[PDB]
């Protein structure tokens, strides 16, 4: 019998586990220690959640090492992993409405986007992942044979062992879905460190995954404070790799405790600066629509949100006075309620950090057309934002906001090459996009742009097919597709002589 | 005109090149800074290599900027990449008697080995990577579709940029022609940090990429000190990866400062200790034959080398007595004398580590069968050496020698989970082996070895097309084979809607 | 509402249709013309089935190239292909046990086989290839470049478009599953002919795709006649790929008529001489069960069954003794009946060649260890039979004869290429075997043997994750695995210049 | 000392084999049979060629299968294999003047297209193939496990054995390198049957196999009937794959023929009617360049040729214009001056189908806008011609010239999915392309095309590494890239328990 916080609303009665999720069993953290999940639609405390310790990471790790070398998990066939898999994603979908609802109260999520995003993705990640199982495959190889004898080489693809994961809180559960299904998928076990901000669909997730059957031991989740549990996963001689989403800073910290630990695997996503660039010869009331999509989807908090928009002269004006007319019908309000648009932003400080960079925006001269404050009303609304006259030098032009602020420089008639120039100047290399007709404009454009991911007429189109992952200062490893496995796996190479 | 060293010596005249190879010419260090490269064979000082300074890897790394932004190298088909790199490994051919003559005087590599292995897998290197230039392939890939719109997902393999790589002095043209050709085949350009005691292939190698039409700046070599050259290559602002195979300390480091600087992308082969198991039903003259062979190549410098013989109780004896008899026969001395079959250590600090690793190994217990001490004879020569009685806790059978020391326990006979434990009871995981002739227990301890590589009735069998590397604390990250190309490639998802 | 035969029977009460399948309906065929379908355990009528005509033909070829061309299965999404054939495969696992029971009644398969082999591998069938949809993927590729312009080249994989697949009555319902999930996974729609003497879970398993909402006209299924729906298939212009397992003269003439009408796509598997190397290194007791199993698994219907077993000199008295006293132990009976372990033989037709073939193997100068006779007692049950004293130029050393029989040769001790070359002289080639505990031989042994697969001491131990098909007079292609996928594909190459 | 007709021409002396080559020895036919080879430029017998004879055919094969069974090919690693092949391509490079010469003179082909097309790709082909030998691998396959044993699976990828090989008269040594170099990569050896109309290239490439040092029997060549040497090849019991490019007639026939012997493996390159689509947002000057590329290129004698243009309405007219300007400015004339932009046709019979052809184009309504006859000169010259007025139920619409006619269509003015029908209205489907600067239609109509390559703003773009074959009744099976290897390879799959 699981301890709960009871609540009712939308429709539904929530059952959300707040405690450690430690080898199949939810556990206060050592202590009882606690801290507050808050509402961002009012400020609210939605519950308290258990605050793990560095002696509950030692048991987690525990819990996952037993769980790899000694548990079920690492003797099932890989159908049948896959096959549990394939449960886990249907318990998923038979709570998605809770689970969307959940990640509403937590993360601020607009509900109908929770649904259809952050929980379904979220789905059909599991889905995917779930049929690689038995499809994982190495090689024979025709090596220089030894004569008069024979040679035969070949190789296994084997899982790593215990892995920690590291999760931002953007899309919490999404998020977490992406690494936990390639790490699950490829034969591991994990143990899971969920932002201190958005602990809760980590929780029912971990739920779930007894209900679905998972051994014990395969999934642990470690909610808390992040440098903590973060520092001790990565000093930990018994995880075997570290997979990060967050801040440069703290990713490159992660990366050095890898280090000098036990030389770990390590992958890492450090956010953006991504460049959207807009062409004349494009369809403009397409590119109105999906260059809002570009900034503001999930109220901006999207680690491949358009940083910079690149629009080419001749249009800018009108672009920018049809961004204005579309971005005054945007719903603000209860991500709860169905005609809303734009949700709050996750978390206080984050809401007070977007205050302060549309403060320096202007500051530094450029122009504010629309938005930069918080919304007159409970939680931490803030309006979506559109600057123009936006200048290479200035501090927007190069830091990433995380928030719904659009942020536009001109460049001149046909100037195509000067253009990509001041897209690529950034350290990071994320995302990207292209909008234009021209079939040669967009494929020369899209060989140019040095960033992990390129859009060609649209944006956010990401899928649990294609790889996500930066160049750069935005880290390396992918997560999604084929590719994301690799990651989970090392290769044995057997060499015979007969 | 080129300054060169140039020495008669084996049925040839060596012309070798002495000075730091930056963007195609061979030029001084700062200052003119030298130190001496010493002859293993009789302690001579071979001649002067200039001592890279600061200055001159930032001078390298531009170089290499300049020679993949703006230079040939970045604007040629990959089949004309692939034409240059095969037209590379015919240079070396050319050249196989003059680079294997280098690597005996440099290294102490036995002439006839150097020819076959040193020069010979380095050109084999070469070619084989040569024919993956024009079959480097992405993806197209199925996604969900933005209906009533289409989308096209597809991926392309880019170059990673600058990279350097730092080259142990086991087999120094070897191991930098591993890394060099998967690096020069994904298209990228190359900073190059030979071992501080092994300059001269390396140097050699250089002036043979002119030979070859290399463009100028694509590939170049840094002679000198290994902290400052890696440290400033794993520092610097413009190289996007760091290859880098040596001692477990400095790899540690050059992965903390891959992290702090611009989160560099690294790979890192760190050595071993190598268990080979050999079974009583295994041919034992065989067995004998290639034991040898997996601790004395090379005078057991050789990061694959076993480090630990687990031999059944039934046949103990009689393998060591075959052992001895076989090393009685052994001729030590000038690696350029074709009886010569051992040939001196790579340097005298090195010989000292042995002989003190020896007096250790009897100091805590074990049996010196045979050997143990420096040859009396002019040179760093050491004696193929046999330990018996060595027990799990010793300093010898955990401690990597990189020397000829056969360190030789017993395990029960029947006992195969008995043995696979010890086996495994290392943070190394770089080779194994096994000798049996039964099926059943060759797969089974395959499966169960923790090591990159599993070696089955042979050993030290690598190939150019078979991936190598390790697990655990001996590193993460393939040379050789298909795999090494994707340490040296990054991928970009680019993603159209229309 | 569909007409059904019911029969309580089982403790189940099947509901079986008995009609055509085409357009997602049960219809009648021409002239409401039927046939009677046979139960092998005593030769009565279990009902009266549709027998397709030439017009049925082409209204199922119309059905299926409209639900390719217009229907929804061309439109919607690979990951939702996938989805619903997982769905399928969930629909037979809640039906698994009618349909095993309708195979016992149709094909003589006993019971508890047919729930765990014919169907269990029919549902891990479609799970497996549901997996593939999303995961089947093109290239990017390096061409040359058009200097000074560009080029991009990609290939895009797409189905072959309305297929035809004849199936045979050795495994109905699991054969079905092997072609149809394969060619269903690519994308494509089909037309399916079922053996004439075993209709009834095809039948079934078209009921079970209404079940599982696969759009109409994707499968339809046209009992009857082999020659008249097989022949109109093969020579329709709007079917684009026949995949065809059988007899050799009926794959011959159907790969004669795809050439002769519009050169569609064609894959064969046309049956199995397959040896069985039994060494005297082998373990004995494994040996005798797997060879027992080799041959008598399914009654003998089974194309990869082992044809000729050669065992050593040695050993070879002591094989047959231990044979003859586990063929003793067989329980002969109804298929229903949870004791039995040998069911009937598939239909009267067969049982007659095979009582032919033993009276052929005796009048040659085989030695008749026991059975060779038809049971007495109603249905077409054979005695399980074991012939020894088998030379290679005798008939039964060279025919297949799809039954119980246990067809045994001696070779010399030590002998290993003379009996390869005795193993390899047949025109088939779509399995093998080989016993021995020594690694050396089992590898050799594998590579020498010219099958399609080589099982190294254990037999038929297919997998749906493992190519299964035939080289020199056994046909081409695979059923089963990644590369079952490539028979329904084609590839498009695309390429731009920029 | 080898028979050679020499010829003084084109600074060259040129010495030309005329000889059957069976064995690694040119030698007479039977009965000392032959036929005259004749020069397309004036009409004059170049020399007389060997007539196979089916006695001769038997040798061929005899020679290749001892080749393949116990000769040096079958045992030498795939990396020697490689080496080889390059060996080969350095050869023919080196011999790459004669080379072009003897198929100007052979095949009509002009000089300086020679040169960098029919030899130079040959070059590159073999070059292509050669890097493939060592990088062919298998897999290893995580099939459910027979607990409480385990199983491993892998598959081995071996050569399929004696191939026949029938190449066309177009590119008579580009194509023959096309099959041979993807054939011999993959380990197998083969018997080449050259057009009868061409044979000269391939007797000279069989010799410089002699200087490269392929094993003798590796490669065979039997000029002389198609119809004779491509019978018996498709009927021999001792070959085991036919690769063909030819007509449909005798394609069909010999898919029949390989049917009927041993259902040997057969790929079909059947030609086709291309359409090209050129809509009015093109660039037009580079539409008019690449469009009449596309069909006049190597005299039209080009299986990919466009065989119908349909040109948007509203630049029809302007089209045209600029089409008969360019094709006014035709240097015609013999294959070896330099300033030639069209040699003469293949061979009289060819000229005298395509005088036919126009005549019945102009018979049946379409307007001839320039050329449709034969040029007034010594030799097979057709003059580049153009029609319009081009209706869908034409002869011309629909039949394959394989000459240099322009065959054009309107289409709607903002039309797109009605143009695609009718360039979909063949039963043809080999290539086909679009001229475009939009994005989106490019897209869309590469999707839509039933074809095995498309073409997007360029034309005759065929690359090494890109995979060339048909659709539909242009046939099945891959030429270049790695999918070629496939068509000459067998997969093996080898299953153990332990």
Partial sequence: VINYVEKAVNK??????????????????????????????????????????????????????????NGLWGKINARDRGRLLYRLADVMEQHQEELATIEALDAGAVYTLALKTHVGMSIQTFRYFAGWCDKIQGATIPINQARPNRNLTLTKKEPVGVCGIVIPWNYPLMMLSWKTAACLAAGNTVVIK????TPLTALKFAELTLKAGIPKGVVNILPGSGSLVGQRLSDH???????????????????????????????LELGGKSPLIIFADCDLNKAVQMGMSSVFFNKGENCIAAGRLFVEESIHNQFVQKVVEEVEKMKIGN????????????????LRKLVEYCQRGVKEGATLVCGGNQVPRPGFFFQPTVFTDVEDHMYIA??????????????????????????????????????????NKA??????????????????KTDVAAPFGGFKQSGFGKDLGEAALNEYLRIKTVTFEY
């Fill in 398 to 439: 190069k830091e990433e906001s995380f928030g719904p602020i659009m942020i536009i420089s001109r460049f001149a008639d046909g100037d195509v090459d000067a253009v990509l120039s001041r897209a690529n100047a950034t350290e990071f290399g994320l995302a990207s996009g292209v909008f234009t007709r021209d079939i």
């Fill in 237 to 267: 001689p018994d995880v075997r790799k570290i997979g990060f989403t967050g801040s440069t800073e703290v990713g490159k910290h992660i990366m050095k405790s890898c280090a000098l630990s036990n030389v770990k695997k390590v992958s």
């Fill in 194 to 197: 969920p932002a201190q901000v």
């Fill in 335 to 350: 991500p709860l309620e169905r005609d809303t648009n734009h949700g709050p932003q996750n978390h206080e400080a984050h």
């Fill in 12 to 69: 539904l009665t929530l059952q959300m586990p707040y405690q450690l999720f430690i080898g199949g069993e939810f556990v206060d953290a050592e202590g009882s220690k606690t801290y507050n999940t808050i509402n961002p639609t009012d400020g609210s405390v939605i519950c308290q959640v258990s605050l793990a310790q560095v002696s509950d990471v030692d048991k987690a790790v525990a819990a996952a090492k037993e769980a790899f070398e």
């Fill in 443 to 460: 494929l020369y454009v899209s060989d140019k742009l040095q960033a992990g991911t390129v859009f060609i007429n649209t944006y956010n």
